[PDB]
Structure 1
């Protein structure tokens, strides 16, 4: 299977409450935190990591609201391949709901032992268009809808994904400090008062694709909840 490191936001029953979690190759989060999923409101996720601290951290917030944060000491050099692809995933249950990404930005940096040796990548979407050639859209994912990214069909069990086209060089054996930082504003709107949903920022192998039966709780990242 694919190598997945993710930061999911799910409201599925399958802890008995909405949470934010850090998944290292398994849907069974290595660490979680209570999340107050606010239907209709726009939320913001901040994911960060640096090779010095070897600590992955995320923070989800809503305006005038709470903020769920979850960290996990992990050396991605041991988990992920050298070259990866980053993305966003989403899955819907039996509920009518949307997983709209309003914005998305990423920054990766490899700093070598030598002088002025920085290597970086940085994309920043604040408006998706109909023909977004720099995004690999998988599943029921689409663009252009209000200049937004619709991960799940805009709905009865839907799984969508959107990874950036260019492969990302997460780590290097010669780097003194490698680090990344992602951010995205979402909006989960559902008519139902308590929908089962799930978004996630994931890092995977350059050729990761939706596993068969990765629906619902599997977030489109895992083929089974092993």
Structure 2
């Protein structure tokens, strides 16, 4: 079972597995059962922005989801990630549908990672920025139902040629090169991630949501992770 850390943009209350009774944003440390949640005020058919930050000094993982001309939703969590995560990781975006469904459109994705070591005090860094996605994007690893190059976007779950999101779909996109997310001889370690998304649904209810996640480098869609497990966890422990 793969080590997962994720910030989930959960659009579907799964009350049987501990979801609060409203669309919410969550911090998931090795479980779909969030460690901290926050009411999120989703706008169907509106482009939204997500922003995740962590730094090894506060050892706190914050995320803020926001639409133009509306309030934030924030959710933070004290967590020492070098006790959770392997030293090297891949980071990625994940998304799923179930009985109910939604477009899981990714529009822009950026990410920054820094290690400021304790031996030499000289920093290592990684930075990537996707504002559009071509049809044959080679620094991305696509898993399951994800496809790029439709209107310059990254489409995480399926969309028909008639634009209608499909059900029982899971897709992920991972950045191709692994990231050095912590190291014992490091004074300060920090990362930032940002993406913009468009969730649109013809149903009265949209599901299930998008997640930003960090994981061991060889992670893949777990068996049966469609629907409420967001392509992230095999089960619901």
Q: TM-score if structure 2 supplies the norm length? A: 0.93
- SS of 1:186's equivalent in the other structure is strand
CA contact (8 A) 1:89 1:162 kept: yes
Structure 2: stretches of 5+ with no match in the other structure:
15-19, 160-165
- SS of 1:57's equivalent in the other structure is strand
CA contact (8 A) 2:12 2:205 kept: no
Q: 1:115 Cα shift?
A: 5.4
Structure 1: stretches of 5+ with no match in the other structure:
none
Q: 1:66 Cα shift?
A: 1.9
Moved more, 9-18 or 49-58: 9-18
CA offsets 1:164-194 (integer angstroms, 9 cap, x no match): 0001000111110000000000000111232
CA contact (8 A) 2:2 2:219 kept: yes
- SS of 1:77's equivalent in the other structure is helix
- Residues of 1 paired with 2:123 and 2:156: CA distance? 33
Q: 1:93 Cα shift?
A: 2.2
CA contact (8 A) 1:9 1:199 kept: yes
- SS of 2:34's equivalent in the other structure is coil
CA contact (8 A) 1:141 1:151 kept: yes
What value does the CA root-mean-square deviation take over the aligned residues?
A: 1.0
- Residues of 2 paired with 1:137 and 1:215: CA distance? 16
CA offsets 1:63-113 (integer angstroms, 9 cap, x no match): 011211000000000000000000000001223421000000000000012
Q: Call closer, same or farther: CA 1:48–1:94 in 2, change over 3 Å.
A: same
- SS of 1:13's equivalent in the other structure is coil
Q: 1:34 Cα shift?
A: 0.2
- SS of 1:69's equivalent in the other structure is strand
Q: 1:33 Cα shift?
A: 0.2
- Residues of 2 paired with 1:200 and 1:146: CA distance? 22
CA contact (8 A) 1:21 1:33 kept: yes
- Residues of 1 paired with 2:43 and 2:116: CA distance? 39
- Residues of 2 paired with 1:171 and 1:96: CA distance? 36
Q: 1:116 Cα shift?
A: 5.3
Q: 1:157 Cα shift?
A: 1.8
Ranges of 4+ aligned residues in structure 1 off by more than 6 Å: none
- Residues of 2 paired with 1:192 and 1:114: CA distance? 56
CA contact (8 A) 1:93 1:195 kept: no
